[PDB]
Ligand binder design. Sequence first.
Ligand SMILES: COc1ccc(C[C@H]2C(=O)[C@@H](O)[C@H](O)C[C@]2(O)C(=O)O)cc1
Ligand SMILES: COc1ccc(C[C@H]2C(=O)[C@@H](O)[C@H](O)C[C@]2(O)C(=O)O)cc1
Ligand SMILES: COc1ccc(C[C@H]2C(=O)[C@@H](O)[C@H](O)C[C@]2(O)C(=O)O)cc1
Ligand SMILES: COc1ccc(C[C@H]2C(=O)[C@@H](O)[C@H](O)C[C@]2(O)C(=O)O)cc1
Ligand SMILES: COc1ccc(C[C@H]2C(=O)[C@@H](O)[C@H](O)C[C@]2(O)C(=O)O)cc1
Ligand SMILES: COc1ccc(C[C@H]2C(=O)[C@@H](O)[C@H](O)C[C@]2(O)C(=O)O)cc1
Lengths: 158, 158, 158, 158, 158, 158, 158, 158, 158, 158, 158, 158
Amino acid sequence: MKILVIQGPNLNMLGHRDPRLYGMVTLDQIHEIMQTFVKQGNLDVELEFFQTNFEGEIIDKIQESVGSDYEGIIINPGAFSHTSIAIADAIMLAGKPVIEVHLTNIQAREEFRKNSYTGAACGGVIMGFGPLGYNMALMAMVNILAEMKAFQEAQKNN
Amino acid sequence: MKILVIQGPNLNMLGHRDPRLYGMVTLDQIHEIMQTFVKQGNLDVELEFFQTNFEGEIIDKIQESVGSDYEGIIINPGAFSHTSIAIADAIMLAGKPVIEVHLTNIQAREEFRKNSYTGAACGGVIMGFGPLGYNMALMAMVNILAEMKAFQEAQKNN
Amino acid sequence: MKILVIQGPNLNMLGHRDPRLYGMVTLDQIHEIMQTFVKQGNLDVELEFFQTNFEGEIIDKIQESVGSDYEGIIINPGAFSHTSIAIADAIMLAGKPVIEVHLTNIQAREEFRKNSYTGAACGGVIMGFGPLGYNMALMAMVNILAEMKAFQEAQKNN
Amino acid sequence: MKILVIQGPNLNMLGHRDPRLYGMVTLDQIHEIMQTFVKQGNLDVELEFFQTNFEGEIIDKIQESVGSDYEGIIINPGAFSHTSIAIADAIMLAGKPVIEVHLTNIQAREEFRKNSYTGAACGGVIMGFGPLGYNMALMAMVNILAEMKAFQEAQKNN
Amino acid sequence: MKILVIQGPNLNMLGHRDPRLYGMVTLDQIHEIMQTFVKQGNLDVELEFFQTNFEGEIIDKIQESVGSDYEGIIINPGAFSHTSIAIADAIMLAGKPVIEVHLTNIQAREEFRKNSYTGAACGGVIMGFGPLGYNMALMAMVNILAEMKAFQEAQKNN
Amino acid sequence: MKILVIQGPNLNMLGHRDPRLYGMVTLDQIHEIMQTFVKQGNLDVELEFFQTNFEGEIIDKIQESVGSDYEGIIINPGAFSHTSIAIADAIMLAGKPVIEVHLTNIQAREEFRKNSYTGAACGGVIMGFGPLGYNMALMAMVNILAEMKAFQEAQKNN
Amino acid sequence: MKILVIQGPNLNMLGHRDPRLYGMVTLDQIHEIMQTFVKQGNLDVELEFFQTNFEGEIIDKIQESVGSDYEGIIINPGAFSHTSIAIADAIMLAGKPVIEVHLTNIQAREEFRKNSYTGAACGGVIMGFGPLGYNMALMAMVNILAEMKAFQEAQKNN
Amino acid sequence: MKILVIQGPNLNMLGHRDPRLYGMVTLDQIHEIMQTFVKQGNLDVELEFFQTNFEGEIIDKIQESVGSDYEGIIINPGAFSHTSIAIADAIMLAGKPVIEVHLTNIQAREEFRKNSYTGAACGGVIMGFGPLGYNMALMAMVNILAEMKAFQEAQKNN
Amino acid sequence: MKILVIQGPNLNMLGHRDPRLYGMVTLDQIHEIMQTFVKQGNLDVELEFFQTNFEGEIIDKIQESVGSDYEGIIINPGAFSHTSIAIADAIMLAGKPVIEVHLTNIQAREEFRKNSYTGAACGGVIMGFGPLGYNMALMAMVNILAEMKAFQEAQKNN
Amino acid sequence: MKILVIQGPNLNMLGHRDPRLYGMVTLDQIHEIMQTFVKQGNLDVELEFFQTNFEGEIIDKIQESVGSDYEGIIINPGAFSHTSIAIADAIMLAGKPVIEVHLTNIQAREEFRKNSYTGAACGGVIMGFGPLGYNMALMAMVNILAEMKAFQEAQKNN
Amino acid sequence: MKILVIQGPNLNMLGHRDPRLYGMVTLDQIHEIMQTFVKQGNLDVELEFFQTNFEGEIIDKIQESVGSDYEGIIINPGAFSHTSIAIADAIMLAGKPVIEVHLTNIQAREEFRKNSYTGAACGGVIMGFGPLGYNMALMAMVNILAEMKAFQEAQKNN
Amino acid sequence: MKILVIQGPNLNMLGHRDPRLYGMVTLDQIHEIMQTFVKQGNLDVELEFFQTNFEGEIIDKIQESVGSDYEGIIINPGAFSHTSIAIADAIMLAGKPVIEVHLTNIQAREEFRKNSYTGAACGGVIMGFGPLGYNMALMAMVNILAEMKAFQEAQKNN
Ligand SMILES: COc1ccc(C[C@H]2C(=O)[C@@H](O)[C@H](O)C[C@]2(O)C(=O)O)cc1
Ligand SMILES: COc1ccc(C[C@H]2C(=O)[C@@H](O)[C@H](O)C[C@]2(O)C(=O)O)cc1
Ligand SMILES: COc1ccc(C[C@H]2C(=O)[C@@H](O)[C@H](O)C[C@]2(O)C(=O)O)cc1
Ligand SMILES: COc1ccc(C[C@H]2C(=O)[C@@H](O)[C@H](O)C[C@]2(O)C(=O)O)cc1
Ligand SMILES: COc1ccc(C[C@H]2C(=O)[C@@H](O)[C@H](O)C[C@]2(O)C(=O)O)cc1
Ligand SMILES: COc1ccc(C[C@H]2C(=O)[C@@H](O)[C@H](O)C[C@]2(O)C(=O)O)cc1
């Protein structure tokens, strides 16, 4: 079971700068916490990670997931959440669970950060738990895929 | 470790009405899924549940948590999320983690449901995963309390 | 055929309010006018009246209507019509006709009195006719149950 | 006692419109339902019906009512309710009761259908009850003229 | 196959006034170029033209289209595009392909001209090509009507 | 020298209704005050008067003035001032002075009466002087035409 | 001479929480300082205190004031100031001097706190003086009530 | 009969700069056209002129008119029309006719020039006729004072 | 202990004009009642009064307060409250307690009067009590200044 | 005569996803139908196609058009239409006819899709005709280019 | 070459304001820094400095610059930048370069500080660089007069 | 001392744009003017220039500046200044001075060009001075590093 993890603009500078909102954890540190979680829980999940500062690369990458080795996407589109109708459109044609994660509680920051075009297109949104939000998304994803598969074959047979 | 779970207006009619947004699960059914989760994971957590259609009762109940047997609140304030500055004020003086949960993705519904006063006051917000969102909150809460306690005594000593 | 009449906040001080908008009639007097209209019309109709200044009690009541001795609701939510998303949701999940009544023409007052959340949920809205408006609501409620009940017997036989 | 019924634009295509909102009734059929309601009620009431798609003709008519064979007006200005300040002014200078009727619940449709200029000018507004709403308007119109006429004889004798 | 061409207010003053936006061509010259197009392309299409400065007349003529010698409508509702909820309703009830044409790019003009209520009701909108836009409409309408016909016989004989 | 005077909707009911904004003067009374003014001042001006409740008739009438017996228009578009882009467009292609008059000070009434589309298209606007505003417009018009004619021939010669 | 002091939601948590805005004083200490003021100034004034987190309770208690042992009300409706059209209505129907008090300067806080519906219904508003504001209210109320009394006997014996 | 003429900021630079909106006429030139008008029409009117760039001086000057040698004010508050609540308040306590004049049609310029606080306080508003607007105001003023005086003594006697 | 009382534009016209909002008392009478209060209460307080219709003068006089014979300011900036960012800045840089007073309840007036920029800069705001509000300000200022003094000697000798 | 066809983000996923709005046709099939049109109509037109999900790439390719093998551009900037001031600038500096095409009627969709910054920069806009719109663009472009050529030789030899 | 430096309200209290935004520099000190920059640069440049808290004095000064010993203006209108249409008009009719300077980054402060009316009138705006910004303005002012003066001699010879 | 100059989209077409706003200068030419200004000033300053039409590349570059051979950044983000929250975040985490430059006065253009997200993040903004603005940015950048570097040696010695 392949899960894609897409990290948006500036998230590679995470850990390195502004401990007030974000703390002292790098992006690589978040990705290995996600590994431990999977190996520890003994889950049959294989993670691929991708980070870009480019709106187009995010869209390209969501489009590749259609040719489905991947079964789900966990995405933090970063500042593009508030501006990108394109990425929201990409998500709406994925035909697979997409969960949005934000490190910070965007309902408590500047006014231009409150709307998430992208979030409205995703099935679910997690915000404000820092790195933890990411494992919450893995948990969520695994239940959803597990749920879909149980439904599918058990409904298909009869 | 005592966690309070507060369920807002109309959430007692859940399961009984409109399978399109909400599906076929009662409020009692959500509360027992939260029990299994705790007993299964072998967590030292004791849940108390409370549901009311009254803005004042929610505020009263948050105020009781100050006299702390309770260490955290998981709250779905329902339609009061969008209107209640009072409940948001209550949350801001709790002096303990408060996580907000919504069954539905409020970024994808009517315009008057997009802002959460209450959500802005909570440390974190989970939306759109249905009943599952609630266990995600338990997971989150347990890590946060575990984290705070590790920090506290290990920083206190030195 | 039992019909619930809910009256919202401050309606009990009716007969003592601004004499221009409201006149000099009492809430007790309106409920007589409705009985008289039932008597004189030979409408097999049992009316129950309930007035509160509490949002939550209105929600409680609407919810108790689902234990369905009652077949319709006539509601004047008062000032809560403009603020209560909670009551609007309850109306939406009553599964039975709800008619909103206002004494005054709310399109003709202050700006914040123009939107009715509750009214968007009801099947219909009546405003501007003072006390008489309740009798119009009765007239319609009787007529909608009669039409619904001819329609339920017209599709169980075929 | 003569009562004018004005019907606004597109109401003549009724019975051929969106079958959800409007059903399959005709404007001719509504006007029968109103006659039948007058007959069966023994209301000494002479109804005249007039439908136009022209703003100016509605204004013309309302104005001709001032040469007062007519004592009341029942109007459904249609789409012009949201745009016509002209018709609203005419209503304001008719010097006789005007009741606005809508078939559909206009609080429950598009944003631009929510304001009624014309409705703010009328004594009262009825929306959401389909054809039945016209009979409610009649009921009220009869009742307002009766009350006005008891009041005109109660202050010329003293 | 009759196509009704409705032209809105002030379009009769065309050609004679303001060369900067509108150029040197009269409304009658536009109706010639359209006939020329049909004649040259050899299409079995009869055009009928109509210009008015009256809102209710436009609605009237749309309403006449339903009694159908007319298979479609090309309309330039002029300034009414931005104000007329009523014409927009008429188009919706027509139940035939309607195309909206504008000589100028209404996206590049005053702010009150960007909104087309009528446009939102039409199947398609063409703007900013001067008189050419009118022929583009014809092309499209002939193509739309061809498909419908092909589709009509091929979907009954399955 | 021919001046056209166009009076908009409801202005024929003037004098007859609401002495608070408008006083006790009929439309015919205003038109004869305009006559006295011209004959008294010994002006070579001939007035034609026109009143309609129809947006289209106003536009038709402005369009006739192009075929110029008329040299100027004095217009009170009434409630159409605030809604009619069409009439404003008509005015902009007249190619002759158009002065707008309002009996009332529209900067002091309801909010929806503050903007005048039409006023923005006219060279000048007079408001709030009651019937007097009309002679002020005649004065203005006469100076403007007198000024234009002086300029024209005196500049043409050299 | 009884003055009813109504305190709104979360004011019972006062003194115990957030020193930056609110300082070190409990609600009970505020009620002492008020009694002290009355006692020292020697005024024939009996205070009665009441705190609630329930909207309908505030309305109830205002409604109880009409049956009048109570000559006036000092109210701090808390967060409800900004949301409660209903409390604002209650104050309007009370027919007695009501003063609104706020500990903090609501003009200098979040944007959603600048609007007081309740304040607009009160005779006067005091804000930003901490507990002192409460005594300022007493001063004013005693003065307002003194005038009324003087005025009451002096305007009947003319 | 003394009329005060107040000219607002930048109106002293008139004539000297930007012939496109304003033409080639100085402020002194406007004031002498107003003189000719009075002496020519043989009117018993004596004009005083005042120009300032100071909001306070305008207010001081309106306040002096109360001590009434003056019977009316003609005012062009310039850019202060759009910003000054103070000057509007001054005008509302003058207790004498105040007419507002603008050289330019402020309904046709930038958006921030459309509202006139001051204009809403004046009895009347004249805009867009250039210097001419000023004599139109003199005409208006003279009729108004003449009218008031005729009414006063003729109503006083009987 | 000098308290500077600054009064804004048009307050000098007080008492003489508009009895409905403002009543029968002159600005000089208000300054008497203030002196009387100080004299009777026996307080070691010297008042200095100042009224102006000029914005820059208010700023000047605030700026003079910094060179400090003056321990505080009571201000009613009048209409400038709603417009003057500059006065608001002056108050912020003053570094002394400033209280804002308004005779009327600016929450209950026109919409453009609800915003106080100056108020948001002051420590506290009093509104709607007529001349009384002025004494309330004195009380508060004397109390605020007493605390500061007590605090000043007690926080250096720890 | 080369025409550059630029297609925006997610248009490559066309045909494969969401039949309700977009239908059953791939982007490559659209490029065929365009070639077919050119081939059949016999036009001396060479098409070059380009699709990208990257904003800067669209700008790059427009910028390449200036070095001109290319006489014109047909563009569907996709979701970027509503957000990209930058693409809109590129189009403005191109100095060649650009037509904007949209498959769907963007006037009839979500509110954030009604605004086209790019559209306002193009000569003309076509929307709501599915793939057909693309050929309509070709027709128009060939006609626009024909005129320009004719005009170009005829305006130098005068 | 004489250059006027106008400084707006509260700039004289500089060196005593909020030490974060402004530091601890004085207006006297800034004017030295500008002299020093003129001296050390050998710019034949005579500087005059003027500071006021009065809108009208700024207008007076700008106007006196038209009696042109001065060739350029460097202005920091202060808080009036956001409110003064008057000053913006004066700048527009100075007929000479005007550069606006701000100490603080006004895009980075409160919402009401973001618009600069005055800045839209100036040739250029400088913000955010504290005192240094004045020397940048000088640099540019010198460079613009040099370029203008090469351009005035390059078109009087040809 | 190395200084990065980033240039945003379309700046490369400079010298070919609208000749009014931009003139006829090239991006190559601006970069010479900056070198020349470094040479002639003896500023030990190494400039690197980079222009892109891609949002992501700007983010990439700003990020690479953190591997700090570069000490300051001078950026003209172009159209992205009004839309890019991403670039604004990158600026915020560069940890070194960033100055925003615009050629044109963006307060003086279209409404959507007025806000600069990017500019709110920079230490300072320069607009309106065309090419010269870059040399002003250099001047300031040099001066800010000199001041920072005197300040870093003034607090490591103490
Ligand atoms: C320190 O550099 C950072 C850059 C981005 C973020 C992520 C956040 C972000 O980029 C915001 O623009 C967005 O609105 C929320 C965010 O995506 C998050 O909190 O996860 C965190 C740290
Ligand atoms: C079927 O009755 C229900 C009533 C409330 C809810 C919860 C949701 C709700 O009450 C909305 O008003 C709110 O904006 C979101 C909600 O709290 C949620 O999705 O959890 C679900 C089902
Ligand atoms: C020169 O007389 C004319 C009057 C109207 C029009 C048409 C345009 C119009 O009436 C506007 O109100 C509308 O927004 C766009 C218009 O319909 C068009 O461009 O076709 C063209 C020329
Ligand atoms: C009593 O019937 C009247 C109807 C219209 C009017 C004219 C005014 C009007 O129609 C308003 O809708 C418009 O905004 C201003 C008006 O045109 C005017 O004051 O002249 C006056 C009296
Ligand atoms: C060339 O200097 C002038 C300055 C002001 C004015 C008057 C106009 C003005 O000051 C605007 O700010 C105002 O909105 C309208 C104005 O008062 C008018 O057109 O009379 C005319 C010319
Ligand atoms: C009758 O002359 C008066 C002029 C001004 C005022 C004061 C009020 C005022 O100037 C308004 O612009 C302001 O919004 C409120 C006011 O300052 C107050 O109520 O104190 C009172 C009376």
